[PDB]
């Protein structure tokens, strides 16, 4: 429950016993006073500053707390320096006065009288004669402590200790004295409570109860009279606060009378907080109590409100907000603020003037006398128990949402949100992309097919537009920062076009390089000269150019240049309003392809490869160079591609090939994907509205009373909010203002929630227990569209199906769909049109209150589908087993093929037309991922994260025929995460970072686990080769009754073959399509040049395109044979012997060594893949280092090289070095040292150059060393022993 | 039958409870609530 602004945790907890009041003996009082250091023993600096012996306030204990200074001490306060000195003096000098009147030795075993001792000591400090107090400085425990003060003498004159027959009127102590330099201004200084003052109270001690009536009666005019009912300190006192009110705690001056209440009530609360059973406290409660001039009815004055809350604080109730051990003004004020805030004055325990009603069923055990009545309210909501304190959360903690039973009505659960939501919420964007590049090479000179340069995919219209550009730009900045990547990317590739041989060198060691464009000098320059980029030799000299070179002359590549040629003329200038821009580019390339040495390598960078420029380029420079590859390094969303020219020889023939059409086409196909994706993101610096798709919407509540079983606003707003952001995050925080305690509860409202929330018919409640439990302050909210780290390669794949199932389920005729093994909480409800009737099922119970969704539209079945029983009475025309099918085979400990062998037939019986199952079979390759998936071959099984989970798999072919035998008439097809990254509005759409380099990983993780899409509703394909080999003509036959259809097979999310029988444009190879009337099926005579998964599409003139199955041209047989040369005819001389390597032309091989986890391209002079049109050869130069370090021919792809084929050359690794010939001793690698030892004798050292080389040793002509940045000494003849 | 305490005004294992049918009060609730068209309105 909650009393006014304060919230009280359910559990009641109070100390269960009271320590018998013990009066200090006379000796102990003598030691306490005469101790080395009084600090701690008598007084205690509340906030003593380490740096300097300074203390703003000092809270004091017993023989000192009684004392109340005279005016001269208040005005001109002392510093913590002379203060310790003042007391360390007076405390001692006082012991004298008192001990000389009572020799300790004889009377130490006599209890001093708490009261008199106080006044007797306080009066001593003020320097008042202390004669009278001594007379009775002791008293026998039997006679009351306050009675001895009266019995000994009824002396009604000594100021500050008027003893009458029944009462002793003395000025309250000063539990706080303030040393000069104190100010209630700072929020940090400890809450003094006005007691730093001398006369803020007037403790009236009384002898008997009738003695007390006579007191109250007489002081009934005074503002109010607080009195401690629970075991008063030295005997029943009767505190009377002076009329004045303290400054600081509330903007509205709080009366000294009411402040004392807060300060105490704030104890009974903080004390209940940690009071335990095992401990025995003085008082079962510390709360004060008003006995006079107090208005019992109203609840305005801070006092009335506080009082009202103390009658409750005596039950053991504890404040949810932890009350500090040493209340500080900032804190006290944050409590006195919470108290003032409009609320409901607790009503369980009515107020009395002489009795505190305490719950019988409560921890609190009444003292004795007549002050505690065991009143029992009709229905107290609190039960007992305590709470262990938990430290403040360092960051906003996310809260999984678990639902309750009652659900709010959309209408009410809306404004509820809109009454406390942070609408125009300012939010940071952060960075959505942080990864490297997603480079993609394309050989234009490679493809042997001519493709009319007039009809390429010309720049898409929309491209240049306020809306599109705005986004293309926005995405750009949303990338945590670029040439360092791009530039390096192009060189990672350029390193493959390097030919070391004399026959026809290309980028041969020490080649000169021209460079245009710099900001200081390009960061890549340092690396080229360092030979840092593996595979590429160190150029002799680099000549910079451009518009801001700062190290070379400034040239304008548009017009002519006055410089000489270069082996490599890497051009990176920008083109930017389209025709003259084309001229700009066509011109630039013209001069860049001019500055290159004859037989060089020009590397221009076009900004808009328009089919307008692709005619001018293939026309003007149709000769200039030999080869040509497009190297689009996608760092951000732009269409600027890089073109590299082979041999800058005058009589070349760079014809536009189908490669270009495909390359160019893939590029755009992705900008539509990347753009459509970015649409879901708000423009920087714009206040958050409801418009933005990815907008972060929160709900800040103030001291919200989340209650179970009640639709109170605070708990009502919680509903909507979580409903508006389910699949997301939902992070709740609690920052403590010196006023109330705000608690925002944001979440990244995406389009994945709008889809889900729409399907909701009602907004369910959330078990507020977890929230009610917190009670600790976390850090302030953040509101940031994106998280900070790039999602796991696994998610890039998962969010690759949530886009796929989304597009499949979006189909109308689909009707009723079920999900075999949806998550514990239906995650598929977001990926389905709010109208389709789906029925998710899972062994575990559904996480979302299935009741809130319309029964007709959403159904939920428990138990597994692996068991035959479950399938009774569940009929859906389409099933989807994504993310489960793999776990079921493992759970049911069964074979993968055998499993689906029993599931598919059940879906057929279940009445299913369509099927989608995230099966995990290696259709592309049996190759695995190092950290993501291990493919144990002894037993068909996977190891996602090697161990984390193990699930059996099937093979592309066996599983393919097994399912075709199950559903013979059904058409099968494999959909897999397409390189176009069109699924993006699911990663960048939900607000998650990523690595443009991982897209490659996931498109490779998607290949390890495709989604076999079956369709009983159509005839399946017919591939004549079956395990279709790349580069072989195959027969494919789509059986469609109407010849008037358009065949359009598309692979990778890009169409490649389209056209009615007569004409068929094919970029995948020679495709001759012709509808045969007889069989009524278009027989496609197709021969592919690219392996993959082609999804055949046969679309009728009218109506949407319809899929008719999917065949898969499998990559060629990866293997490597080398015509290794014989020991003789093979030399260790400079001219490197070369064994012709036999490998499919398809795979590009590159020599390298396996250093660490990756492959590092060996330097071209040591080894290389010199390729003649007739054959690819392995050129190598024998070095003594060859026996220790071995080389590997590796599959060079845009990805890390050498994954498909990484075979190690074990021959060049064993070639035994003779005694009759010179041999080259190089260095093993960039980080390794060596030394030669002929015949077991330290002959020489490669690591350290011998000041003077040994007889017959010199540097080689080349730098054959694998590292390319090391010398390579040639020895005479002998028996050297390389020792790395 | 473990003690509860306040959730509900009566403990089951509470002090002096008493099962004891009386032909007089046939236990219960409300099953025959009328809702038919004409009768509900
Ligand atoms: C504790 O739960 C021990 C079991 C005693 C009661 C369990 C239920 C059987 C008696 C029913 C009492 C309420 C109405 C039948």
GROMACS .gro file of C-alpha atoms in nm, chain A residues 11 71 82 135 288 465 487 542 575 577 665 670 710 720 992:
model
   15
   11UNK     CA    1   0.640  -0.702   0.479
   71UNK     CA    2   2.453   3.249   2.318
   82UNK     CA    3   3.970   2.390   1.859
  135UNK     CA    4   2.476   1.639   4.560
  288UNK     CA    5   0.733   1.035   1.811
  465UNK     CA    6   1.572   1.227  -5.476
  487UNK     CA    7   4.091   0.139  -4.982
  542UNK     CA    8   5.442   0.663  -5.411
  575UNK     CA    9   3.211   1.234  -5.920
  577UNK     CA   10   2.394   1.647  -6.236
  665UNK     CA   11   2.220  -0.564  -6.107
  670UNK     CA   12   2.072  -0.418  -5.261
  710UNK     CA   13  -0.602  -0.322  -0.916
  720UNK     CA   14   0.012  -0.034  -2.266
  992UNK     CA   15   2.051  -0.359  -3.352
   0.00000   0.00000   0.00000
